[model samples]
Each structure stands twice: as C-alpha cells, then as structure tokens.
Target chain A: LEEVQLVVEPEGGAVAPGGTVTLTCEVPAQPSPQIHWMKDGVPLPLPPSPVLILPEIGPQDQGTYSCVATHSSHGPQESRAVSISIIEPGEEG
Target chain B: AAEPLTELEESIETVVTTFFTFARQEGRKDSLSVNEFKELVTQQLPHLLKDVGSLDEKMKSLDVNQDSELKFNEYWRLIGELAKEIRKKKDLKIRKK
Candidate 1:
C-alpha cells in the first residue's frame, strides 16, 4: 500500500512580534482531503484551509506546528513538523 | 470529527485557492499573467484592492523578476500586504463598534 503524502510550506520560522506568517499544506490526493492543524502537539481549532495565517504573532504563539491530511479511503497523513519562534528587534540568530 | 472550520480558516483557504483559479486560465498554470491578475483582483479581491491604483502597475510592481508573470511567491506577497491593511481596518472597526 502506498502511503499518503503531505507537505507544509515555509517549514515554520521565526517572525517579529506583530508580524504575519502563513503556513500552507499540500496533499496529493484525488478529490483533495480535509486538513487539521496542531501547534505544540495541541490541535488548533482552525478551519481546514490550505493556508494558515498567523497575524500579529507574539512570543506566546510560538511553537511547533504541523498539518494532517485525512481522507475516507486513505489513512491520515501528517506533514513534517516545523517550529515557530519569536524574534525580537535587534536580535541576531 | 473535529468542529467545523472557523470563518477565518475558510477564508484563508479561499485566498490561496483563488490564485490557482485565475492562474490556470492561461499559459503556465502555476503563474498569473497580466490578464489573470486583473481578473483575480477584480473578482476575488475587489474590496481589498479597490483603492490600489492601476492593476497594470500593481502587476508590474509585484513581478519582481521582470518576467511579466506573477509567481506564487509574488502573489503571496501582494496578499500579505493586503492582509495587513485589512487587519488594521478590522481592528479599527471593532474598536468603534
């Protein structure tokens, strides 16, 4: 059996406080599928969208995020996890 | 078995999918031609981009490579900027209400 595949865009990264970051999920399947997102291992109550927009992000919002693609015929497929960190002004990394 | 997606989440999907809808109407299904961009802005982004002057110029400004086609990255940047504007606008509206 072939495993379901999923991809997440931007792979997560640091962003300044009050900045915006968008994470997109891609799944290669017929008729598409449903998407669910999790942050720091906790499911986020967000709608199933290819794009997840984090507007005005702050330190408290930083965490590892991933997406899961689920279909009736196929088992759930999870994307590689990515971390989101906060970067304050004048900080170098 | 999770709760239905929030309005913002659904809108986020709409924003990303709208790009592909217009992009596939012509050559290079992945990118947007000048006509495609115009159509997208006029139809999908009418309220967001209404005040922005000259669709031609907007496309030119966003086409960083001078290739005359708006790549997905370029389109993303345009939407990101517009989203910022909407964020501030919504904040003001909520405060006034």
Candidate 2:
C-alpha cells in the first residue's frame, strides 16, 4: 500500500460576491493520484490538477468541498473538507 | 426600464437553482439514463425548451456507447448548449425588432 495526503489552503474565509478564490490540493510523492472533488459529498468532475479555481464566488458556490485521492494500491483517501461561504452586500450594506 | 431585465435575471436564477437541486440529488451516481433526463427536461423546461428533436439521436452521439447513461460533464454540456441557444434566439429577436 502507498501513502498519500490532501491539503487545502485558506480553510475558512469570507469573500464578496464576484470575488475569486483558489483552492489547492497537494499530494506527496506518489504516482499522480486521481483527484476527485466533491461539494457536500457529491462528486464533481475532476478538473486538471494542482488547483481548483473559483473565478467568481456567488450564492451558488457556497458549500462544503472535499477532495479525494484514489491510488492503485491504497484505494481512496479523503482530505479534511473545507466549508466555503460567499457573502454579498446587503440591500443597504 | 430594468423590470424586464430583472425578471430575466430571476428566471435564470430559478434555472440555476433547479440545476443545483438536481445535481445534488443525482451526483456521483451512475449516469442518468437518457430517457430519465429527457423526462426531466420536458417536465421542468417545457416552455423554455421546446422542439428537442431527435433527443435520442443526440444522446447516442454524445453517449459514445450503446449504454444509455449521461455523465455529469456530458449533461452539463447539454445544458450549456441549450442556454447558449436561448441567448442566440434572444439576440436575434432584438436585432429583428
């Protein structure tokens, strides 16, 4: 079996609507592990590696996101999930 | 002045909300069968998407297999294409008038 880990930067934060956020996932030396992304436990299509970019954070982008790594020998390993909240200015704020 | 635009924005918001609900309900599972997805489109988007001609053929072309299930990316592309089509039609209407 092989060992792997997933890491995320800027775990908790608030960003204005239309702002951008970058979520990074890093893995130690291993055959490039297949990275699977998920929001609230639902798998998202794995985009190209290194970083998942949220170009604009909107109401729809608010959720908990987790990354899972699948290796040939070790099966699947999941990282600590991060919760993201997008805040918009109030009608007068 | 902004009323119509606001209404359209609300309509698009509804579309996106419904999409999130569906995605949440059906995520990471076996690809939804074409028939089932069509039933959803027909039911949910009746007026917005009329004339979905030869959807089976379209699905077959997209499926790339005799197996009739659509992955998330595949389904997303379909929705994206339909949204673009709506934008094109709206632009044409503006140009004509």
Candidate 3:
C-alpha cells in the first residue's frame, strides 16, 4: 500500500537552554491527515499545525521528535526523527 | 488535508530547503561556507538582502563561533533578522484597511 510521508523541520539542531526555536512538519499528502508530534513515541499536546514552536526550550525539551501523518490515502507514515540537543554555552557537545 | 500549504508555510519550507541545497555544495552538509552563503542570498534572497553593501562583512558578524561557516541555526537567525527589518519598514508603510 502507498503511504503519505511527513518531514519535520529543524531536522537537527542545537540550541542553548532558555532559547527559542520553531520547527515544522510537512507532508505531500492530499486531504492531509492530522499531524501529531511524538516525543519518544508519546504524542505532544499540540494540535495539528505545520509549524511547531518551542519557546524558552530547556533540557526537558531535549529528545527525538517525529511527525506522524495519518490519512486515508496513506499509511500513518512517520517522518524521519530529528534530535534536539540542549547545551548551555561552554558545555559538552 | 486536501489543500495547498499556507503562504507562510510554503515560504518557510522554501527557505529551509534552500539552505540544505546550498549547504551540501561543500565539505559539510550541515553548514554553509562563506561562498555557499553568498550564493544563497544573492540567488534566493536578493530582495531581502539587496541593501547590504558587503556580504562578507555581514557573514563575518553572523559567524558567531568564528568558525567562518554558518550552520543552519545561524543562517536561520540571519534570515529572521532580515525579515524583521522588512517587517518594521513594511509596517510603517501600511495603509489602514
């Protein structure tokens, strides 16, 4: 079966804690299904929007995130996961 | 789900995708070299950046780590700054509708 795909933004990024960032998830699917953001397999509370904003992101914000696209046209295709690492300046990489 | 993306969403994707396309030209796919950065702005960001006199100087200032290269985050912020400048002046010219 063919499936739609979702690609999430800021694909990989580094930001100091207390910094702000916004990412996005997109799919080529028509009649686009809902997009859910998953942090380590769990869904974030945010409703479906192509863009995801992380204001004042802290260590708790560090994790692997994937965007799942669901629609009748495709498998609940999950985009490749992107990792976000939070480090204060002068900290380890 | 059966519609096109909003103008803003399409714009964001275009910019981000442009970065990756140019960033892959040289050694690091994750970063844009001075030359790559220059090409990007001139080609894709001509209007937003046409006012700048010296691209090199601007690059120097944006290269925060002094690494002489711009990562995605750095490039993103640079674009954001430029957009802010446009937004400010554009707002000033706004006609009440």
- Going through the candidates in order, their DockQ values are 0.02, 0.03, 0.03
Of candidate 1 chain B, the 10-residue stretch with the lowest lDDT total is: B88-97
Residue pair clashes in candidate 1: A47-B5
Q: What root-mean-square deviation over C-alphas does model 2 reach?
A: 16.8
Across B1-97, the per-residue lDDT of candidate 3 in tens digits comes to 3245788887787766767777556643445777776766677666666544477778877775555557546666688777685666456868222
In candidate 1, how many Å is residue A70 off?
0.4
- Quick one: best TM-score, which candidate? 2
What would the per-residue lDDT of candidate 3 be over residues A24-82, giving only the tens digit for each residue?
76555465566655555222444456677887877767677776666665545667666
Candidate 1 per-residue C-alpha lDDT over B1-97 given as tens digits, one digit per residue, 9 for 90 to 100: 3344788887777765766676556644545677767766777676666544477777777865555666656667777778786667556758223
Higher-TM-score candidate of 1 and 2: 2
Model 2 agreement with the true structure over B1-97: per-residue lDDT tens digits: 1234476698876756565555444433334555556776677655556556546665765566333445656666676767776677567757224
Q: What DockQ does candidate 1 have relative to the true complex?
A: 0.02
TM-score of 1: 0.40
**DockQ of model 3 vs. true complex:** 0.03
What DockQ class does candidate 1 belong to? incorrect
Q: In candidate 2, what are the lDDT values of residues A34-73, reduced to their tens digit?
A: 5656556333444436577887777767667766666666
